[PDB]
């Protein structure tokens, strides 16, 4: 069914309702179990049931917790609801042994990928991060058949998502990097044409994917996935390149968000952004200039366009996570250029201006001058910096010093080859 009915629109709803009803059925087929009694094979009812529990939502992992738990009914039924949210992550603990018991890699690598899903969304991303790092299913997917390849890709999405939802640029980068090196998420979700560049032959074989994959209600937006990746990297790389073009350059890395920004950067003709790419480029330029203001443009407007914002109840959180990072890294991009110009700084100004507070701006500027290896002297009780780090001619001098220094270093390879 949930394949041949199509799609944005509507026969659709009585069919969703049959879906409700089959939910019913599978529920039913569960409590009954005389099986041979209880435990020891039923587990597959349980399997079906967790396949119809697994891809459900923040709102139904937090109808137990944020439909108010002292505002909700105290009736055995409400506990059966609060236990109903437990009952799938229960059958993990239970029915491992009822499988627990089969070692078959193709069901092991399948099951655990669905389990790591539950964690990051319903609960801790910690437990999600733990579970895959324990399992080491990078080796095991080789032993697994090509549906579970799709699950491996699919699970990696939702972890780079809940990286960005917990607010960690780094982990969201590395997670969503592996997908965005490629343009195969298309064919992995069973959507690919034979020609959509030139590559994707042959006819009778891509139909296998159409037959095996996939209901529409399990999908995610790829512009989401794109933007979430390109924004994670943004906060890492714009200070990085601000540092680089203040002549810290030797760390300039291709085939990264650097490239993905570059292709959009080199438009002669961009005015207002009307694509999600262009909204990323738009906020990127604002970040370079170091105005907070330009971040807010794409974070509000393109997220309404685009409904990158409107798919999370945690967009409320992730707003604050985005905002203060922008305000800190924009301050940092500003400082990477401006610090030649300074003689000193009212650190109080920076707090007021970038909308931050002194305890944090202390810790920021403290971390900065330690680890970015600046020639600032930092009076933290007086809230003053005294810097005086020269020279504008240095931009040429250090550059020819490098051009010089590069001479001898390659030259020693030309020696060591020769001999």
């Amino acid at each position: 069914i949930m394949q041949n009915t199509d799609p944005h629109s509507q026969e659709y709803v009585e069919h969703l309702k049959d879906e409700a009803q089959v939910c019913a059925i599978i529920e039913r087929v569960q409590r009954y179990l005389e099986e041979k009694g209880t435990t020891e094979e039923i587990c597959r009812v349980y399997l079906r049931r967790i396949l119809h529990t697994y891809y459900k939502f923040d709102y139904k992992a937090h109808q137990r917790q944020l439909t108010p738990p002292e505002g909700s009914s105290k009736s055995e039924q409400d506990q059966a609801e609060n236990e109903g949210e437990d009952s799938a992550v229960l059958m993990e603990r239970l029915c491992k042994y009822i499988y627990a018991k089969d070692r078959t890699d193709r069901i092991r690598t399948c099951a655990i990928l669905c389990h790591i899903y539950h964690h990051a969304l319903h609960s801790r991303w910690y437990q999600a991060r733990d579970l895959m790092l324990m399992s080491h299913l990078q080796d095991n997917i080789q032993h697994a058949d090509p549906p579970v390849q799709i699950l491996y890709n699919r699970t990696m999405v939702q972890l780079g998502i809940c990286a960005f939802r917990q607010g960690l640029t780094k982990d969201a980068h590395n997670a969503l990097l592996d997908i965005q090196s490629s343009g195969r998420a298309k064919e992995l979700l069973g959507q690919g044409l034979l020609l959509r560049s030139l590559q994707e032959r042959n006819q009778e074989q891509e139909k296998v994917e159409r037959r095996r994959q996939v209901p529409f209600h399990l999908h995610i937006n790829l512009e989401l996935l794109e933007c979430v990746y390109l924004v994670s990297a943004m906060l890492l790389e714009i200070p990085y390149m601000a540092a680089h073009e203040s002549d810290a350059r030797r760390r300039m890395i291709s085939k990264q968000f650097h490239h993905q920004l570059r292709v959009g950067e080199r438009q002669p003709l961009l005015g207002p952004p009307e694509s999600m790419r262009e909204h990323v480029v738009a906020a990127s330029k604002a970040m370079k200039m170091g105005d907070w203001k330009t971040c807010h443009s794409f974070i509000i407007n393109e997220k309404m366009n685009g409904k990158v914002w409107d798919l999370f109840p945690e967009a409320d959180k992730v707003r604050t996570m985005l905002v203060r990072k922008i305000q800190e890294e924009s301050l940092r991009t500003y400082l990477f250029t401006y610090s030649s110009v300074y003689d000193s700084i009212s650190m109080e100004t920076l707090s007021d201006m970038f909308e931050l507070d002194l305890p944090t701006v202390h810790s920021i500027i403290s971390k900065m001058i330690i680890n970015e290896e600046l020639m600032a002297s930092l009076d933290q009780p007086t809230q003053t910096v005294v810097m005086h780090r020269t020279e504008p001619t240095a931009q040429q001098n250090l550059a020819l010093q490098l051009a010089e220094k590069l001479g001898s270093l390659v030259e020693n390879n030309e020696r060591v080859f020769d001999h």
Binding site: T337, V341, D343, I345, S346, D352
Partner: protein, 169 residues
């Protein structure tokens, strides 16, 4: 983008745009205005505005300019019979007049207290404008030590002489 990558692949396109517009090279600035005012342009110009550039281009004097221009600003910023087209071009051109003023006073003064500096310049807010100066300063149009412990500004006689002060090109 240019200052980053090297480097265009981003100039011949501008030349092409110029051609399109009918030009062969790249337009220039209030230079442009000299251009299209070699004609009888000091005249037809309606005198809502006739005596606003008689400040900006013609009249001196840094420590009065933002004062002087406040009234022809308030005049033109009533938009509906004067082409609403104009009055979205006005806020940038107001900042451009400030930008003009900010460049001069690095040669008029060698230092100035920020409290004096506030009174020199009629504007909406100081908290806004300082950041727009620090922006211009960061984009190397002038050199200032506007941020500083006392909250006072130092333009400096030379210190280290560079084209950062001069606005470089």
């Amino acid at each position: 983008a240019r200052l980053l990558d090297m480097d265009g692949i981003i100039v011949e396109k501008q030349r092409r745009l110029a051609t399109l517009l009918g030009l062969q090279a790249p337009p220039t600035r209030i230079g442009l205005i000299n251009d299209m005012v070699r004609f009888n342009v000091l005249q037809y110009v309606v005198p809502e505005v006739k005596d606003l550039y008689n400040w900006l281009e013609v009249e001196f004097n840094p420590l009065k300019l933002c004062e002087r221009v406040t009234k022809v600003l308030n005049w033109v910023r009533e938009q509906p019979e004067k082409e609403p087209e104009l009055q979205q071009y006005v806020p940038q051109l107001q900042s451009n007049t400030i930008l003009r003023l900010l460049q001069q006073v690095a040669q008029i003064y060698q230092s100035i207290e920020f409290s004096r500096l506030t009174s020199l310049v009629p504007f909406v807010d100081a908290f806004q404008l300082e950041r727009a100066i620090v922006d211009a300063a960061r984009h190397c149009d002038l050199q200032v030590r506007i941020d500083h412990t006392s909250r006072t500004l130092s333009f400096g006689s030379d210190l280290n002489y560079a084209t950062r002060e001069d606005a470089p090109i």
